C-alpha cells in the first residue's frame, strides 16, 4: 500500500432489505499511551468499604467497544426498526481498522 495511499474508505450507511438491515458505521479514533506502557496492579488499598474492595490490573492496551444501539442506528433508522418490526436480532458483523 504505502504511506501516501489510503487503506480504506468511509462507509457509514444503512441498507434496508426485505428482512435484513445492514447498518454500517465509521468513526475516527485516537489512542494514547496508557500507564506509560506498563502493567499496573490496582486495588482498593486506599481505604474502601467492604462492598467496594476490588483487585485487578490496568493494561497499556485500548479496546474498541460498539455495544450500544446508537453506534449502528441513526434515530431515523431506529424509528424504521421499531414501528415496522415485531423482532430483530444480529446475524454477522464485520470490523475494520
Amino acid at each position: 500500500d504505502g504511506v501516501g495511499n489510503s487503506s480504506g474508505n468511509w462507509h457509514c450507511d444503512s441498507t434496508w432489505m426485505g428482512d435484513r438491515v445492514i447498518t454500517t458505521s465509521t468513526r475516527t479514533w485516537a489512542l494514547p499511551t496508557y500507564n506509560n506502557h506498563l502493567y499496573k496492579q490496582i486495588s482498593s488499598q486506599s481505604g474502601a468499604s467492604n462492598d467496594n474492595h476490588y483487585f485487578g490490573y490496568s493494561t497499556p492496551w485500548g479496546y474498541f467497544d460498539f455495544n450500544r444501539f446508537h453506534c449502528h442506528f441513526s434515530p431515523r433508522d431506529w424509528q424504521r426498526l421499531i414501528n415496522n418490526n415485531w423482532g430483530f436480532r444480529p446475524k454477522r458483523l464485520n470490523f475494520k481498522l
Binding site: 441513526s74 434515530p75 431515523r76 424509528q79 414501528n83
Partner: protein, 105 residues
C-alpha cells in the same frame, strides 16, 4: 387532476348498472294494446366484490430526524376511534389525509 382530489382518467372504471327485470302481475284475459302498469312488487339482494390492485412508491429519504406520521391517540377514551359504538354504529372521527412523509423540492 380532479379538483376534489384524485386520479384524472380519460377512461375511468365503467358504470355498473343493475335493474330488477319487470315481472308483470295478472293480465286481463282480453287483449289490451296499452302497456302494463301492474307489476309484482319485488326487490333483489346479493353480495358485491371489488378488488383493486395498487402500485406503491417507496420512500428513499436520507432524512436524519424522525418524520411526522399518523398515529392513534394511545390515551384512555370512551370509544376507540374508527370502531363501532355500543349501539353498533361505525364512525370515522376525522379526515385522514395522505401527506405525512416529506420530500425535498
Amino acid at each position: 387532476s380532479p379538483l376534489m382530489g384524485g386520479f384524472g382518467l380519460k377512461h375511468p372504471p365503467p358504470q355498473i348498472l343493475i335493474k330488477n327485470t319487470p315481472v308483470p302481475a295478472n293480465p286481463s284475459t282480453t287483449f289490451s294494446a296499452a302497456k302494463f302498469a301492474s307489476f309484482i312488487t319485488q326487490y333483489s339482494t346479493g353480495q358485491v366484490s371489488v378488488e383493486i390492485e395498487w402500485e406503491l412508491q417507496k420512500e428513499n429519504s436520507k432524512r436524519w430526524n424522525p418524520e411526522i406520521q399518523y398515529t392513534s391517540n394511545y390515551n384512555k377514551s370512551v370509544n376507540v376511534d374508527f370502531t363501532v359504538d355500543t349501539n353498533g354504529v361505525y364512525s370515522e372521527p376525522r379526515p385522514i389525509g395522505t401527506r405525512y412523509l416529506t420530500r425535498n423540492l
